[model samples]
Target chain A: MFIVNTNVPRASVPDGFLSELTQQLAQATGKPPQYIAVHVVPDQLMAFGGSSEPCALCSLHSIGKIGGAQNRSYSKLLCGLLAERLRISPDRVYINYYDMNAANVGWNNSTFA
Target chain B: MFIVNTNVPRASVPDGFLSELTQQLAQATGKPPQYIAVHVVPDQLMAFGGSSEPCALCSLHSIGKIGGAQNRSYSKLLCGLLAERLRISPDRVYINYYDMNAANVGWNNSTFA
Candidate 1:
């Protein structure tokens, strides 16, 4: 059996304001909003991005424009959270913040090898 | 070697139509559907949604509603266009598509980081 796990959060979120997140995510993916598992942690959400191993098995997608130090910092933290779940090095987890000005943004598609 | 590749079509699709891909993928791996892997293709479908990397190794998921300008475009050009080989070219290879009405959806847990 192969497993690839991962998660996504709305990037460029305002302090204490949650990202459109699942809603935006749903729009990009094309399924009902209920389809994704939303993990709401009061202090912090431990949402799963989706990937398990060999990494290729995991397909990834992202949204919103991510930039600036705070935005970049949060993105890094999220990637760390992903790595922690896989029990791998933090650096191994990667996040690509899209800068395009469109309602839809992020990896067009991801594949495993 | 580690490699990552990406693609996407349809913020919400209804064209020659594509992207409303099969099986929610993992729904949290939360598991069991064959439970993964094949020479699965979508449409222009270089589509090889599975991993063979050290990158969180692999697990992915998704959902949806519509499409954008190019509408993203051709969630797949594939219609029984098949081939066999470990062929590694431009992408690491992987894919995930989901439907909310679907009995299930893509991964909620992927970690290869």
Candidate 2:
């Protein structure tokens, strides 16, 4: 799975933003748009940097295809996207990238391995 | 915290799909259902394996208790359940398993650690 999840305070994000983000993530990760999953949990009460001024917590997890270069690129891409769209500061955004093993993943009633 | 999230296209998933998934995960992982955060994002524009079929992306994340044989069992359980209920190809559904450090997960007022 190529999953991108975003958590932000309620109503901070405009409508149609998630669709756009999902498309961006698929393109950025070189994953097919159909296989990429994007989630935005809004109306949450979350804080960061000791402040809660429209900050966000973002995470990207995939089986394989993640590393230093991908992390740096995704962080920049997502942070810039949030900044331009939601006015959240890139500094306040926290993004975590996880590279999972195919053996640890499950699909179709079987292990990917 | 145990988190089980699913991503599928809009209206393809029934209303009770997520609740059932959450309960099953709690039982399978030996975690309390109350603490397990479940998210189901539907009406998404996604594809997998170059197909727009009724595929899904499922992920399970927790502080610990994931590895080796546990992954195998979950794959079978989740994939079987999805195949039975959603009519999604078990082969097309992808499940990502994550074992996180308590210190790396934040909840309530602080980290799980």
Candidate 3:
């Protein structure tokens, strides 16, 4: 699951960005679009570094393919996307990469594991 | 930090739900609710297991007091709440558990660590 929650104002994201990002993320993570989830929360109430400047918090969690040396590329890809779409600097964006246990993630009454 | 970003429509999760969830989460995690941040991005665009069903993705990240035996009870409690309010099958929901390093999380002009 890929969640991009940002404090950028909603209007800035524009239509079709989410779909485009869904595709971007799927390709970036080597996951099918259907299994990838993208969320953009604009105008969220949040503070970073004690400042309310435009910032984002991204959580990229998956069971099979994540963590270790792979983080560098994912962070660069995601941060770049946010920088372009949200007009925020990459430095302000914090991406949390989590490698989950498939069993810990549930869907359709069963564990992904 | 606890983030409950859902695909449920905006109005479905009432104004009180976010606040209530924050409190519930703080209690559940033994963290102060104020230190616990909550966000609900309803009307989020998402799909689960190849279906556009009402589902949610919860990421609970904390530097302490997570993992191991603590997970079982938290899952039951959170899933139960989602089932009640969102009217979605617990089967459709997926919660990703993340135990983060405090230094990895930033706040108030510095890292939480």
* iRMSD, all candidates: 13.2, 3.7, 3.6
Model 1 lDDT per residue over B43-82, tens place = 1111222222211111222233323421122111111110
TM-score of each: 0.26, 0.65, 0.65
TM-score quality measure for candidate 2: 0.65
Candidates ranked, most accurate by DockQ first: 2, 3, 1
Alpha-carbon error at B54 in model 1, in Å? 27
Expressed as tens digits, the lDDT of each residue in B40-97 for candidate 3 is 6567765554456787877666777665555655677777778888776676677776
Query: In candidate 3, what are the lDDT values of residues A2-62, reduced to their tens digit?
Result: 7766788878887677677777777877887777766566778888899989888877877
Looking at chain B only, the TM-scores across the models are 0.19, 0.85, 0.89
Off by over 4 Å in 1: A1-65, A103-113, B1-69, B72-113
Q: Which candidate model has the greater lDDT, 1 or 2? A: 2
Worst 10 residues of 2 chain A by lDDT: A1-10
Would you list the clashing residue pairs of candidate 3? A49-B109, A102-A113
